[PDB]
Ligand binder design. Structure first.
Ligand code: ADP
Lengths: 268, 16
């Protein structure tokens, strides 16, 4: 209808699930964006429901540490999500390349992540799929902002009202309440944040096993620890935050607001 | 110890 008229396609940034991201400019404005080009014809019934949800949910979110959706356009057989341009790749590839972060850089990183999650929550959005793969870096430059992305699995919540919103997310990062098929809500994002912080500081995750059955046992039991030697020189307040985030009871589990007031985030 | 590999998003329970 109206993308072909205002936007000029440019070079490919990446491929995906019947998607192709190109750099684009809004011609008249001159400003440059990322256009996620989705093929309607090759999408499942279920995939359309997500696209619509992703579009609706992303529209609510204006924050410096969320990837902004500026526009969502439906033409014949093709759907275009117009996003902020981000040129730094995934937090994932950066953790792999640097192996692990200092307590300094881990604090700065998760602080931005927690401000992204806090905004989401205050707008009644639970993400459900926090992982390094779904965090992107603004640019290739120094101290570039971490921006939350991929709201394809995100749900809307009314206040603090828990419910069974379905089994959704990434095995390693799922919360015990989801594994227990309990009604859940905002606290599930804070368990994922736990997993991300742990990964940030030693470069491996707190819960693993070849057998998905066993991985889920560990997570439900909160069976993680802080092995020697790599954890020995890591502050007890760093660990204190992880424990407070990796609390198997979501009621006693720390919130985004609380986590940001935690002494390991707040001062330094 | 466990090492860090990339994990995919599921939208349903899929026993693996
Ligand atoms: N706003 C953006 N700016 C630049 N590259 C992006 C942007 N959004 C996504 N990409 C990249 O485009 C490729 C496909 O992204 P997309 O299909 O939206 O999600 P996913 O990477 O989870 O499949 C990846 O390389 C991703 O990092």
């Amino acid at each position: 209808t109206r993308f072909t008229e205002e936007y000029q396609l440019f070079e490919e940034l990446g491929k995906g699930a019947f998607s192709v991201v190109r750099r684009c400019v809004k011609v008249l404005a001159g400003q440059e964006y990322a256009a996620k080009i989705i093929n309607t014809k090759k999408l499942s019934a279920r995939d359309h429901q997500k696209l619509e949800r992703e579009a609706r949910i992303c529209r609510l979110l204006k924050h410096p540490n969320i990837v902004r959706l500026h526009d969502s356009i439906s033409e014949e057989g093709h759907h275009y999500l117009i996003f902020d341009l981000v040129t730094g790749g995934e937090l994932f590839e950066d953790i792999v390349a640097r192996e692990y972060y200092s307590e300094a850089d881990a604090s700065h990183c998760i602080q931005q992540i927690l401000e992204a999650v806090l905004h989401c929550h205050q707008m009644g959005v639970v993400h459900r799929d926090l992982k390094p793969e779904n965090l992107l870096l603004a640019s290739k430059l120094k101290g570039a902002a971490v921006k939350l992305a991929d709201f394809g699995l995100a749900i809307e919540v009314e206040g603090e009202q828990q419910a069974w919103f379905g089994f959704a997310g990434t095995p390693g990062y799922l919360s015990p309440e989801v594994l227990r098929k309990d009604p859940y809500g905002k606290p599930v994002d804070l368990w994922a944040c736990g997993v991300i912080l742990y990964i940030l500081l030693v470069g491996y995750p707190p819960f693993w096993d070849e057998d998905q059955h066993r991985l889920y046992k560990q997570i439900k039991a909160g069976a993680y620890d802080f092995p020697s030697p790599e954890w020995d020189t890591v502050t007890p307040e760093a660990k204190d935050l992880i424990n407070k985030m990796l609390t198997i009871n979501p009621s006693k589990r720390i919130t985004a607001a609380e986590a940001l007031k935690h002494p390991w985030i707040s001062h330094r | 110890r466990n090492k860090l590999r990339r994990q995919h998003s599921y939208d349903t329970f899929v026993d693996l």
